[PDB]
Structure 1
Amino acid sequence: TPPLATTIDRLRDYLDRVGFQQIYKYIVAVNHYAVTPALITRNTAASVHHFFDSRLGGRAEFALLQCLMTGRPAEHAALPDKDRALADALVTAGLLRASPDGREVSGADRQLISAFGVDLLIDRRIHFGGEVHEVYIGPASYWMLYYINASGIARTHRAVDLCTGSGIAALYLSLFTDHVLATDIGDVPLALVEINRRLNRRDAGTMEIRRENLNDTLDGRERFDLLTCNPPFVAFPPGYSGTLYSQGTGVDGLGYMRDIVGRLPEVLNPGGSAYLVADLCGDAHGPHFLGELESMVTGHGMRIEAFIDHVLPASAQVGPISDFLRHAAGLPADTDIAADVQAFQRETLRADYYYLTTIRLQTAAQNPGLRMLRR
């Protein structure tokens, strides 16, 4: 607890000493850095290792860094003296592993990335290995943040990142404002955002971390200038269990998006803005949910902009959904989940397509209206 805080401080010192963020940015390059967190994965790790070995010369100062980035083993005695004591502290914290004979250090369940200028530990199981992850991050996380107008954020603006997960959106907002609230209800994400807050030299002085249900924060009396939320939004067929980060509420998975949008006229200060993201079902003309938002244009004079950045036919999602459901619940391979998914997509969701959509909503707009951007 204080030992962990000191360990994260020393980790931060190591990342600074060897220029981690710059090395990550160089490896992935500027045309990929903000596209997706799934850049260093089990399918690219061999190439990452080759770069460290052949272009960075295998320098020992980068050995602990690779343990964190890909899980690659480093011989304990080969670590530089300062990095060796940090490695021991990370093993004690459960953030790296030691081999059974203690002669090397290697990856545990946390992967070190950089996103939007922040250093971030994420759940390594999303990009490596074969066990279902407990903390989500994905391209939807990134595209939510991409559309934020950072130059319009004042130091005194009050911002909230609901359903914060790893903390990425809250930490991004903390680059610009000194008043950030980050919320979640999962034990595992809450422990991780606490680590990532400290990893970026923040504390409760400028970023509050709160265990609180989305609808409780939304009903509350606190008012915000800026809101971000990537909520659970996936609709799974009746009878199937997902995970805390994936399964949306309501008949079509969008209950949490409805909850948020409905309270924006009250929770945002006049002229404040919210950024949401979801993979929205729709027909050939667009996502069904945008039709529900005309009530916010007419009823509350908001401006609402929807940025559609990925389109897939519903049939292309049947496999990924069924695979996720099978793996999350440990179901056997003879269950016809795919037919259940198809039937649900067509009766309940009316989903011909899925549209990965970032939505910007502004209260008290001078130019109210709904705008849907498609390529």
Structure 2
Amino acid sequence: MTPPLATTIDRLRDYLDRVGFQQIYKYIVAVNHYAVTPALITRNTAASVHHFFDSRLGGRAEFALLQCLMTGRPAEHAALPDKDRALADALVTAGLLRASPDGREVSGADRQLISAFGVDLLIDRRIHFGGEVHEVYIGPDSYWMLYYINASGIARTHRAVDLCTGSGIAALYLSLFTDHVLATDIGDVPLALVEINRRLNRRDAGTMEIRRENLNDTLDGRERFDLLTCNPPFVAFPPGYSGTLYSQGTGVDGLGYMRDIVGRLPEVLNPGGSAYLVADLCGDAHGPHFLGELESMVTGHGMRIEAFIDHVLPASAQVGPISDFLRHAAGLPADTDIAADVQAFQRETLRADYYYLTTIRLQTAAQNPGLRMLRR
């Protein structure tokens, strides 16, 4: 990051501390929702958030810049408190907020401020509000991967890696507990965002390395880890369609990266280390096909593998979301039957009767080896 941007993020952190942002967010979304999904403050709930600030927080000017960041709500530049006003100008210069053409208002740009798992996080606002296709991913799968981590088991000396870090959320969560975190990605846009989010939570290169590196290169490297997290691209799209960097999995069925990671865990994890993965896995009525491929790791390497299935959908319920996404992502018109192509692909190639949103915990050199699949 440039020095001017670094100073601006430091001043943003100061503002969030002054007005208690994380507590305000936590109160608005409530403890029964805070760790369920990042899609809580959205275009559909913004009016309710504005009403809360107006009627339960008195419309106080100290929260005006905060709402520009949380929902994009415009604030009059002249109504900003003196200290907040200079910071607002710095955020506009950085492209993190917008000014109206006459300079009289400040409002949202393409970054939304949330909190997750105790960290403060800017994300791509287009994922929850209108507009062009988003360029940084975050979702409920991101959250559930972190939910199952046993934080009290993390030592300050444990070497941790978050592959495919995106916004940085998993790496930043790990940094709450260990002093050694590596966060990787290959996309320009997520790499610039995790740089900001690292500084926003008072981490630096001393405790969290940000590295531009393909996961396949990190997997075959000689660095060894005690703890690994990865939410990789895992979605399979029909032949002839392009997705995005964060969505499109490798291999015939979109699971190539999951195979790459799992296959290397006995070599890249120290003995007794643990990995946490998440993916929306296709399967039949019994369960996800991918879990059938993992018995080799139990019998071949003595691993313990636990699969937590937290949501089940029929394949028919994904035809609309997937086909809509493909249409938006490639800028396609509305006269091709993408839904039929998705349906045919699910049936012939994926053999997908259901999609199983699954967090997978894997441990090497297990005292109690085996595969356990948990469904409600």
TM over 0.5: yes
Residue of structure 1 equivalent to 2:290? 289
| Cα displacement string for residues 228-249 of structure 1 (whole angstroms, at most 9, x for unaligned residues) | 0000000000010000000000
Looking at structure 2, the residues matched to 179 and 15 of structure 1 have their Cα atoms a distance apart, in angstroms, of 26
Task: Give, in whole Å, the separation in 2 of the partners of 1:50 and 1:160.
Answer: 41
- CA positional deviation for 1:103: 0.2
Aligned partners of 1:250 and 1:214: how far apart in 2? 15
Deviations 1:138-167 (A, max 9, x none): 000000000000000000000000000000
* Distance in 2 of aligned mates of 1:102 and 1:341: 47
SS at structure 2 position matched to 1:11: helix
- What's the RMSD between the two structures over aligned residues? 0.2
SS of structure 1 residue aligned to 2:28: helix
1:156 match: 157
Q: Deviations over 1:57-90 (max 9, x none)?
A: 0000000000000000000000000000000000
In structure 1, what is the equivalent of residue 16 of structure 2?
15
For 1:45 and 1:253, the matched residues in 2 are separated by 35
Provide the secondary structure at the position in 2 that maps to 1:249. coil
Q: Does 1:254 align with 2:247?
A: no
Tell me the SS of whatever aligns to 1:348: helix
| Distance in 1 of aligned mates of 2:208 and 2:14 | 21
Give the unaligned 5+ runs of structure 1.
Answer: none
| 5+ long unaligned stretches in structure 2 | none
- Whether 1:302 aligns to 2:270 is no
TM-score, with length taken from structure 1: 1.00
Identity within the alignment, %: 100
Distance 2:105 2:84 in 1: 13
C-alpha distance after superposition, 1:19-74 (max 9, x if no partner): 00000000000000000000000000000000000000000000000000000000
Q: Deviations over 1:176-232 (max 9, x none)?
A: 000000000000000000000000000000000000000000000000000000000
Between the aligned partners of 2:300 and 2:195, the Cα distance in structure 1 is 39
Q: Secondary structure at the match of 1:286?
A: coil
Q: Secondary structure at the match of 2:50?
A: helix
The equivalent of 2:373 in structure 1 is 372
* 1:245 alignment partner, SS class: coil
TM-score by length of 2: 1.00
Give, in angstroms, the shift of residue 130 of structure 1.
2.2
Where 1:35 maps in the other structure, the secondary structure is coil
Looking at structure 1, the residues matched to 337 and 124 of structure 2 have their Cα atoms a distance apart, in angstroms, of 29
2 CA distance for matches of 1:347 and 1:129?
Answer: 34
SS, match of residue 35 in structure 2: coil
**In structure 1, C-alpha distance between the alignment counterparts of 2:61 and 2:50, rounded to whole Å:** 13
User: How far is 1:338 from its partner?
Assistant: 0.4
Cα displacement (A) at 1:131: 1.4
Separation in structure 2 between the aligned mates of residue 374 and residue 46 of structure 1, nearest angstrom: 37
- Would you identify which runs of 4 or more consecutive aligned residues in structure 1 move more than 3 Å? none
Specify the SS of the correspondent of 2:106: strand
Partner SS for 2:132: coil
